[PDB]
Structure formats: structure tokens, C-alpha cells
Amino acid sequence: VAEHWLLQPLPEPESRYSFWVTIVTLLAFAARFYKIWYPKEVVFDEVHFGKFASYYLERSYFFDVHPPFAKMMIAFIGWLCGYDGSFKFDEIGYSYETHPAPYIAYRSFNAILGTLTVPIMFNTLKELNFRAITCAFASLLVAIDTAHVTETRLILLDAILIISIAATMYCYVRFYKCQLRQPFTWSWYIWLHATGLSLSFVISTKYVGVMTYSAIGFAAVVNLWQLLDIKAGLSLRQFMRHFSKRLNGLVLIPFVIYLFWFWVHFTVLNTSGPGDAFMSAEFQETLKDSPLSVDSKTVNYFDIITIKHQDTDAFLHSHLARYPQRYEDGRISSAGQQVTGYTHPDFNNQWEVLPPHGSDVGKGQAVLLNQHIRLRHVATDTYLLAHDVASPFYPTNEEITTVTLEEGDGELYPETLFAFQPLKKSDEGHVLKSKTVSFRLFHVDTSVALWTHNDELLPDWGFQQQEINGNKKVIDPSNNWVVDEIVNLDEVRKVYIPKVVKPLPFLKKWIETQKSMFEHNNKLSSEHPFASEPYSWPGSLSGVSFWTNGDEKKQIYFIGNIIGWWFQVISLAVFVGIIVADLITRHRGYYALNKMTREKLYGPLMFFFVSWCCHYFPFFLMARQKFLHHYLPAHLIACLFSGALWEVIFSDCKSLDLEKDEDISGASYERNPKVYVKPYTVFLVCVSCAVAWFFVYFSPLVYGDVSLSPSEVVSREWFDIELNFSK
């Protein structure tokens, strides 16, 4: 693919490329470093990534839905500044003056990466044999894009993502040119492993990096398919050498580097922290106690405990009121004592943990997960019970009640047996601890889990409390409980108690964290006001508010350069039209396009078009929340594509003979199609001036540094762009 085009010498002297790359890099630097100290407050997702940087410096364990590499790079800048992690970035608008985080250093690090993306983009087109002005223009579309500028000056992961994607595209183009010239050279190995390294940084930043693996993977498979052809003149042994080396450089080594970042993450984060609630008790045993205080108090037999629901914050509660003999649907209840979910702490939330009848287990022995227990309600002196009676609201779920001590020590003994069932089978037989160990309150006889909900409350006979029922869907994550407090805790157990750190194998630790990452990422389905669908992204039809100051009437708003984005949409549509027209005309025996024009169209332009498709279309298959920033990888590729496309349109594209296919072996074709440089440069200058005018017009919303009058705010409201201070 594009062998004759990509093996040409550069169309211009290197001094012209060096001139234009310097100019566009200086523009990119100026746009990102402009007022980088402003605002002196926490902006948007700086609340998350600044906070994660602080937890790395404190060595406090935290959970996140994204892989650790980009957060560790941010934390590493804090570490170089001697920052201790004291400031937590808790809310948007928090002043950096009261608690000095090195926010200028963090923002400057991202501004450097955003600036360095531009010369990588330039050099990608240079290596694809495009003119220096074409390389300049495509890189300018990223240098002065309002969305790329806003994101790459704040403490966000996207600066690290976007540079890693740009580096991946560049390294793969370099690898492919080495493959065309001479495979298995030292340079061929360097560029193969550099593509793999860059691909590893992409997926180690965000899981959306799978789209970059898909783009490079497709191009690598297309080239392996050409090398498998008998016409390539390769033996099957030489083909297998290509396959095994690419598999190693593009899959195996990048996967080892991906695992290395998790190994660093778990080695740095060796202290208990806000992430503990997302992990098993066995994982938490690998963490040291915080130098601070931990309420993870061991639960013993004969401890009086409160049991709290994780999703509704309701306590397991009981009182002397009884279920009505019939529910409203005419089903018969036990007329037993009510067990309900109550959101306020009281004496009716108190349950004593008792061992099974005839056990040798005494006072002060720890309760283990998945052991049989009984729960005695302290206020009514009754045992918790579940039975084959249907619950008030759910005909398939069991009513939860209580029984007298005499009856529960008699025939109903099996129906009083519960277990603190662990969420993970790996955690069976671990010591139960308050606040840190989630469990299902599992009934032994009927095999149900205790469950509660807050969408519907019990009628007046149940005091408008939450229903407690025996859910047959035991594995349901909504069946999760925690021991909140131990009411009868001895004074010796109140003071801090050390912990023997137990080792866990790295792969077990990584598999657990990885499952939790994917499960929590798939649960991000709430409604968010700034969520946007893939169809709106190429038009930049809506944006995201990043920061607002009410007193100064200033705001930061995340939006694309609409002139630049629409120019790229037009470019994508024009290219599809050109490819369809070329295919139709060829099928009619009419060969309109020169061989060299086709090598540009079906080589670099098709590579970028398919790469854009890989970063755009998969989002239509995703049911989770999505946002405009998810399109920035696709926009980055669309900038390269649009620059390249318009050079082709302004080239002498005509075949020498419209009746002859120049792709036939031995056909004469024009090897150096003339670019119409004068009209092409005028066209690029006109588009560049329009994109620059838009960037200047929106610059108050990119920087947040200028107060706009309400009429000036409204003049920037179009489509679904809602701005603050329009009134």
C-alpha cells in the first residue's frame, strides 16, 4: 500500500519543514502557556486527578475506573516539586492560595505534552511525504483548537492520552516506511517497539485506547495480508518471522508494560485509603494501617452491632409492631414481628451476633465470613428469622421476621441460621471487620440474601420504613451490607491495634482490581447534564462547563473550534465522494485518477479515515455515559486527514490515458504530480485565518480570564451551547 509514494524523497528541502514545525510549535506553546496560573482555583476534573496525585504522595490506596499510568505521571510532577499530598482538591472553585498544591507545575506538564503533540502530528505528515505547508496546516488545526487547548492546560489525563496517540501514529508510519525499504533492520525493530511502547501508554491512560490498538491492528493486519500473498515472494518461514516479531512488539511487550504500571501502583499505594471499600478483605490485608485512625474493628461473637445497607444507607431494624395478617394484594403474612430498613440510628438497630447452638465458640473470638451465626434483636429479645412466606411488595422474595428465643431454640432453629457471606469466594474464612468488610446477609435454610430498597416505602402499618426481604437473586450487588458500629466495644479495643500485612500474588491483586474497574465503569449510567451523544460530536453542537466565578462573571467552557471541526466534516464527506466516484468510474472502464493520486487516497488518507472510524463509530455501540472529549482522538486524526486530503485535491490528479488502468504492471504514469502551490497556499491561509479568528473569538471561554457582558455571552450561544451569565 502506497509503496511508490512513501519511498519518494521529500517534496521540499528540510529547511522548509524545520521553519514551519518551529512556527506551529511556538503558536501551540503560546496558546497553552497563556495565563497558565489562572484560575487560581480547582477546575472541573482537577477534583479527581489532583486528588489522585495527593493519594499517590501519601501512599494511600484509592480506586479508579481508569488504569494508573497517567495519574502516576501527574503524581510524579508533584513528587518532583516536593509536594506532600496535603491538599485534596475536594470541590471546583477551591483556592490554591490557602493550601499550596503545585498546580502551576501540573498544568505546565500538561501544557508541555499538548505542545509536543503538534510537532509529532507535523512529522507524521512529513513522513507520509506531504508538503511542509500541509504538515503546518494539519498541526495548526490542533495547535489552536479550543477543546485541545482547554484540556491540555488543566490537570487532566487527556494531554497524556493525546500525545501517546500522536506518538503511536508517528511511530507506526516510521515502522511502515522501514518495512517498505528493508524489513528486519535495526531501525525496523526500534520503530516496531516504539509503536508498541506508545500503544501501551495509550491503553495505560484510558480504556478508550483500545480504539488506537484497533486502528494500528487493522493497518498491521492489512500489511500482513499483503506479505502472505505468493506475489510478495516470501516463504512461509519468512512470513511467520514477520508475524511473531509483530505479535511480540505490538501485543506481548505492550501488555508487560501495562502490567508494570499496576505493579508500580500497588507498590506505591501500600497504606489503607478511600479505595478499600471497592476491594476484598484479602486485598485490604495487603495494606498497612494508615498512620491515622482505622475503624476496621474486628467483630467478635457476643458483640452488639448495627448492620447498614450499602445502597440505601438504611439500618437493619426491628420493633414490636407486626406484619398485617393479609397484605393489600390478599397474600397471607406470618403476622410475625416486623423487620424493616430505618435510616436513623436508634436502639432498634442493635443486633447481637450469636454463634450456632452447641458451638464451643466463646466471648472475644472473631466472627469469620461464611460461618453460620444467629442475630438476636437486643430491644425485643427475639432471633432474626426467614421463612417460606412471601414479602409485602415482592411475591417471589421472603418475608423477614423475628421469633422468640424458645421457638428459635426449638423447631425453628434452622430458620434462624444466617451467614455473613463474602462478596468474593476468595474472602471466605477471613475475619469480619466493621466498616471495611462488605457482605451479603445470607439465610442458610432457604438460600436467600437480605435486601432492601427505597423506591417504595411500607404503608402506614410499617411506619413508611424500607422493606427488608429475602431476595432469591443472592448475587445481586444491591444485597450488600456492612457492620457500621460495634456498640458494646471494650475500651482496650477502642485504642488503635496494629496489623500483620499478608502478601497477595501480583496477578491475583491485578485481576481483582481489573474486574472491579470494568464492573464500576459499566455502572456509570446515571444522567449527567453535560453528557453528549456521538452524533453531536463532529459538529461540536454542545460543550461542557469546566469552571465559573459568580462575582467576576467569568467561565471556562469546553468546546471545539467549530470552523475547524466543520472543515473536517466537509473533508471526510468529500473524500467518501472521491472514493465512490473512483470506484464507479473504474467499474465503467474510465480511469480518471493517476496512480500516484490513488496511492495517496488508498494509502495515507484511507489509513487516517479508517483510524478516524475506529475512534468514532464504536461509541454508537456504548450504552454508558459519553462526553465530547471522547471525540478528541478522532478529531486529532481528522486534522491529519484534512491537511492531507486538500493537498491531493490541489494536485494534478489526472491519468495520462483515461482508457488505461495505470495500476496495470508496465503502464506509464506521472510519478511527480504537480501541486498547484499558489491557489493551495491561498486556500490554506483563508481556512487558517478563519480557524484563528474563531479561536480568538472564543478565547475568553478557553482561558476564563475575561468577563463577558450578557450580550457577548448570548452572541456565543448557538445550537445547544448554554453559557453561564447570559442573563
Partner 1 sequence: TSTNATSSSCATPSLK
Ligand X SMILES: C=C(C)CCCC(=C)CCCC(=C)CCCC(=C)CCCC(=C)CCCC(=C)CCCC(=C)CCC[C@@H](C)CCOP(=O)(O)O
Residue 620: contacted member of partner 1, ligand X, a copy of itself, none (CB under 5 to 8 Å, by partner type)? a copy of itself
**Can residue 490 be called a binding residue for partner 1 (CB under 8 A)?**
no
User: 576-605: which residues touch a copy of itself (CB under 8 A)?
Assistant: 587-589
- The DSSP H or E segment spanning 400 is strand 398-404
User: 475-504: which residues touch a copy of itself (CB under 8 A)?
Assistant: 475-476
Residue 213: contacted member of ligand X, a copy of itself, partner 1, none (CB under 5 to 8 Å, by partner type)? ligand X
Binding mask 167-206 for ligand X (x = CB under 6 A): ----------------------------------------
Residues preceding gaps in the chain (C to N > 2.5 Å)? none
Q: Are 77 and 109 in contact (CB under 8 A)?
A: yes
CA 695/CA 140 separation, integer angstroms: 11
Residue 39 preceded by cis peptide, ω within 30: yes
**Can residue 389 be called a binding residue for partner 1 (CB under 8 A)?**
yes
Of 641, 479, 545, 540, the C-alpha closest to 45 is: 545
Which sign, positive or negative, has the C-alpha torsion 281, 286, 288, 292? negative
**Can residue 228 be called a binding residue for a copy of itself (CB under 8 A)?**
yes
Which sign, positive or negative, has the C-alpha torsion 320, 325, 326, 332? positive
Among 23, 38, 81, 214, binds ligand X (CB under 6 A): 214
Among 105-113, 329-337, 506-514, 564-572, the segment contacting partner 1 (CB under 8 A): 329-337
Angle, alpha carbons 649-651-655 (nearest 5°): 100
**Can residue 230 be called a binding residue for a copy of itself (CB under 8 A)?**
yes
344 or 587: CB nearest a copy of itself? 587
> Which set of grid coordinates corresponds to residue 85?
499530598
CA 125/CA 121 separation, integer angstroms: 7
Among 12-20, 146-154, 471-479, 556-564, the segment contacting a copy of itself (CB under 8 A): 471-479
If you count DSSP H runs as helices and E runs as strands, how many of each does the chain have, helices first? 22, 14
3-state secondary structure of 13: coil
**Can residue 47 be called a binding residue for partner 1 (CB under 8 A)?**
yes
CA 364/CA 187 separation, integer angstroms: 68
Residue 229: contacted member of ligand X, a copy of itself, partner 1, none (CB under 5 to 8 Å, by partner type)? a copy of itself
Residue 251: contacted member of ligand X, a copy of itself, partner 1, none (CB under 5 to 8 Å, by partner type)? ligand X
State the helix-helix crossing angle for 158-181 and 69-80, rounded to 10 degrees: 110
CA 139/CA 124 separation, integer angstroms: 10
517 or 714: CB nearest ligand X? 517
Among 210, 431, 444, 531, binds ligand X (CB under 6 A): 210
**Can residue 644 be called a binding residue for partner 1 (CB under 8 A)?**
no
- Per the DSSP assignment, residues forming a β-bridge with 469 are 399, 451
**Can residue 511 be called a binding residue for ligand X (CB under 6 A)?**
no
Among 124, 318, 338, 397, binds partner 1 (CB under 8 A): 397
Residue 230: contacted member of a copy of itself, ligand X, partner 1, none (CB under 5 to 8 Å, by partner type)? a copy of itself
229 or 652: CB nearest a copy of itself? 229
CA 645/CA 393 separation, integer angstroms: 63
Q: Are 16 and 140 in contact (CB under 8 A)?
A: no
**Least distance (Å) between residue 192 CB and a copy of itself:** 24
Among 185-193, 408-416, 544-552, 599-607, the segment contacting partner 1 (CB under 8 A): 544-552
Of 704, 596, 713, the C-alpha closest to 655 is: 596
* Residues comprising the chain, all counted: 727
Among 330, 358, 505, 666, binds a copy of itself (CB under 8 A): 330
Among 217, 336, 345, 356, binds ligand X (CB under 6 A): 217
Among 129-137, 170-178, 522-530, 565-573, the segment contacting partner 1 (CB under 8 A): 522-530
3-state secondary structure of 200: helix
Ordered DSSP codes for 86-155: -----STT-BTTTS---HHHHHHHHHHHHHHHHHHHHHHHHHTT--HHHHHHHHHHHHT-HHHHHHHHSS
Of 207, 220, 134, 204, the C-alpha closest to 169 is: 220
**Least distance (Å) between residue 543 CB and a copy of itself:** 17
Residue 246: contacted member of a copy of itself, ligand X, partner 1, none (CB under 5 to 8 Å, by partner type)? ligand X
- The residue type at 213: Y
**Least distance (Å) between residue 522 CB and ligand X:** 5
User: For residue 503, what is the DSSP state?
Assistant: P
User: 515-534: which residues touch ligand X (CB under 6 A)?
Assistant: 518, 521-522
List own/partner pairs for 423-430 with CB under 8 A and 24 or more apart.
Answer: 423/280, 423/480, 424/280, 424/282, 424/512, 426/280, 426/282, 426/508, 426/512, 427/280, 427/281, 427/282, 427/369, 428/369, 428/370, 429/368, 429/369, 429/370, 430/281, 430/282, 430/285, 430/368, 430/369
CA 213/CA 298 separation, integer angstroms: 46
Q: Are 510 and 262 in contact (CB under 8 A)?
A: yes
What would you report as the CA-atom Rg of the chain, rounded to the nearest whole angstrom? 32
Among 219-227, 484-492, 496-504, 520-528, the segment contacting partner 1 (CB under 8 A): 520-528
Binding mask 59-98 for partner 1 (x = CB under 8 A): ----xxx--------------------------x------
472 or 499: CB nearest a copy of itself? 472
**Can residue 393 be called a binding residue for partner 1 (CB under 8 A)?**
no
Pairing of strands 304-309, 350-354: antiparallel
**Least distance (Å) between residue 230 CB and a copy of itself:** 6
User: For residue 477, what is the DSSP state?
Assistant: G
**Least distance (Å) between residue 726 CB and a copy of itself:** 12
**Can residue 232 be called a binding residue for a copy of itself (CB under 8 A)?**
no
Q: Are 53 and 269 in contact (CB under 8 A)?
A: no
**Can residue 44 be called a binding residue for ligand X (CB under 6 A)?**
no
**Can residue 623 be called a binding residue for a copy of itself (CB under 8 A)?**
yes
User: 618-637: which residues touch partner 1 (CB under 8 A)?
Assistant: 625, 627
Of 246, 32, 253, the C-alpha closest to 142 is: 32
**Can residue 620 be called a binding residue for a copy of itself (CB under 8 A)?**
yes
**Least distance (Å) between residue 425 CB and a copy of itself:** 11
Among 99, 520, 624, 671, binds partner 1 (CB under 8 A): 520
Binding mask 419-458 for a copy of itself (x = CB under 8 A): ----------------------------------------
User: 586-625: which residues touch partner 1 (CB under 8 A)?
Assistant: 625
Ordered DSSP codes for 546-607: EEEETTTTEEEEE---HHHHHHHHHHHHHHHHHHHHHHHHHHTT---B-HHHHHHIIIIIHH
**Least distance (Å) between residue 476 CB and a copy of itself:** 8
**Can residue 528 be called a binding residue for a copy of itself (CB under 8 A)?**
no
**Can residue 621 be called a binding residue for a copy of itself (CB under 8 A)?**
yes
Among 40, 99, 181, 473, binds a copy of itself (CB under 8 A): 473
CA 109/CA 53 separation, integer angstroms: 13
CA atoms within 13 A on the CB side of 546: 26
CA 301/CA 320 separation, integer angstroms: 25
Q: Where are the beta strands (DSSP E) in 436-500?
A: 438-443, 449-452, 466-471, 480-486
Among 3, 90, 295, 328, binds a copy of itself (CB under 8 A): 328
* Interface residue list for a copy of itself (CB under 8 A): 228-230, 326, 328-330, 472-476, 587-589, 620-621, 623
Binding site for ligand X (CB under 6 A): 207, 210, 213-214, 217, 220-221, 246-247, 250-251, 518, 521-522
* Interacting residue ranges for partner 1, rule: CB under 8 A: 44-45, 47-48, 63-65, 92, 277-278, 331-333, 388-391, 395-398, 470, 472, 520, 523-524, 526, 528-530, 545-548, 555, 625, 627, 722-727
